[PDB]
Write an enzyme that holds these catalytic residues in place. Sequence first.
Site, PDB file in Angstrom:
ATOM      1  N   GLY A  37     -52.922 -18.021 -63.722  1.00 11.29           N
ATOM      2  CA  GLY A  37     -53.458 -19.146 -64.452  1.00 11.29           C
ATOM      3  C   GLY A  37     -53.775 -20.457 -63.778  1.00 11.29           C
ATOM      4  O   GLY A  37     -53.287 -20.786 -62.709  1.00 11.29           O
TER       5      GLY A  37
ATOM      6  N   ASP B 108     -40.895 -14.698 -54.548  1.00 11.98           N
ATOM      7  CA  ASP B 108     -42.140 -15.381 -54.197  1.00 11.98           C
ATOM      8  C   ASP B 108     -41.883 -16.787 -53.609  1.00 11.98           C
ATOM      9  O   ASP B 108     -42.524 -17.778 -53.986  1.00 11.98           O
ATOM     10  CB  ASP B 108     -43.135 -15.384 -55.387  1.00 11.98           C
ATOM     11  CG  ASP B 108     -44.595 -15.505 -54.992  1.00 11.98           C
ATOM     12  OD1 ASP B 108     -44.930 -15.171 -53.824  1.00 11.98           O
ATOM     13  OD2 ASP B 108     -45.402 -15.954 -55.845  1.00 11.98           O
TER      14      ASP B 108
ATOM     15  N   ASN C  56     -44.833 -22.757 -53.846  1.00  9.73           N
ATOM     16  CA  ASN C  56     -43.813 -22.639 -54.887  1.00  9.73           C
ATOM     17  C   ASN C  56     -42.640 -23.595 -54.687  1.00  9.73           C
ATOM     18  O   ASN C  56     -41.582 -23.450 -55.305  1.00  9.73           O
ATOM     19  CB  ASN C  56     -43.372 -21.192 -55.042  1.00  9.73           C
ATOM     20  CG  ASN C  56     -44.430 -20.345 -55.743  1.00  9.73           C
ATOM     21  OD1 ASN C  56     -45.428 -20.846 -56.284  1.00  9.73           O
ATOM     22  ND2 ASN C  56     -44.245 -19.045 -55.754  1.00  9.73           N
TER      23      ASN C  56
END
Length: 284
Positions: free
Chosen positions: A34, A142, A147
């Site tokens: 997204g 991840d 991140n």
Amino acid sequence: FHSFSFYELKNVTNNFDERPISVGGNKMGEGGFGVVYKGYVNNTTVAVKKLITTEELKQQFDQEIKVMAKCQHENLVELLGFSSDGDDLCLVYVYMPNGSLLDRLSCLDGTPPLSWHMRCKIAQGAANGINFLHENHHIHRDIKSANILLDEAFTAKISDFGLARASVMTSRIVGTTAYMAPEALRGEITPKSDIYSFGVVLLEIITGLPAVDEHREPQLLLDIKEEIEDEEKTIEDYIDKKMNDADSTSVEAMYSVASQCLHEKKNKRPDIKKVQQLLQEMTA
Ligand SMILES: CN1CCC(n2cc(Nc3nc(OC4(C)CC4)c4nc(C(=O)N(C)C)ccc4n3)cn2)CC1
């Protein structure tokens, strides 16, 4: 967490304006799964994620919520709410005014270069968040600088727990290839794979270089570990030139943590508590 009706969120994001926040729209960036939009709820800035079948995207949206409810820490992004509209799925987070470590290392949109001091604190904060996840029997899967988000004080916040798992093999191998441990690339799910990914992140912090660049030699940042060990290059040759306050001793000390994290044998890697301890000693 606050349950938003989809209408509430469309209005706060200027009808989910896909234009960048620099032009006048609400787009801040994109993720796996997204686009991220800038929203304003009660004069508070929020981050909004608008999310391969409909029944498969649901369990990946429920993940970010499942993990984010069990795991709250000072070095983890805080989820504020969500929107259950069946087809349309939205996640709402505390807005990080300084975006990702990835963007701050590349000085994207003209932000100034992070100092060595700021870098060391971000490394420690990132390790503290990984430690909390490992203590709560969670594998992130991840860990990468995109991140790692930075708040109003450049406090590191681990984000994106869409691929996070509780405590092993899998047929569906997921993650970011340039940050992945050889065994994670083989299907193994282990907290040791996260340590490896963190080692790539520490090399990004020292060098200011992305984990992968097609127009580079070597193309993968983790390969510089071999160039140094093979005395082809030195760590001094690789330190980010966009700093004025880096010292040999603490740079060597962080490189030593990164080097240990990047061992090819998962069991020869240190655990996060040792990583945390070593990064603490670097600034003592
Ligand atoms: C030059 N200025 C311009 C403004 C800029 N800026 C501030 C932000 N804030 C921001 N961004 C996020 O994601 C990004 C990094 C991909 C956009 C984000 N993600 C999450 C999250 O946990 N997600 C979605 C899973 C939570 C909070 C978040 N907060 C972005 N850009 C800083 C530099």
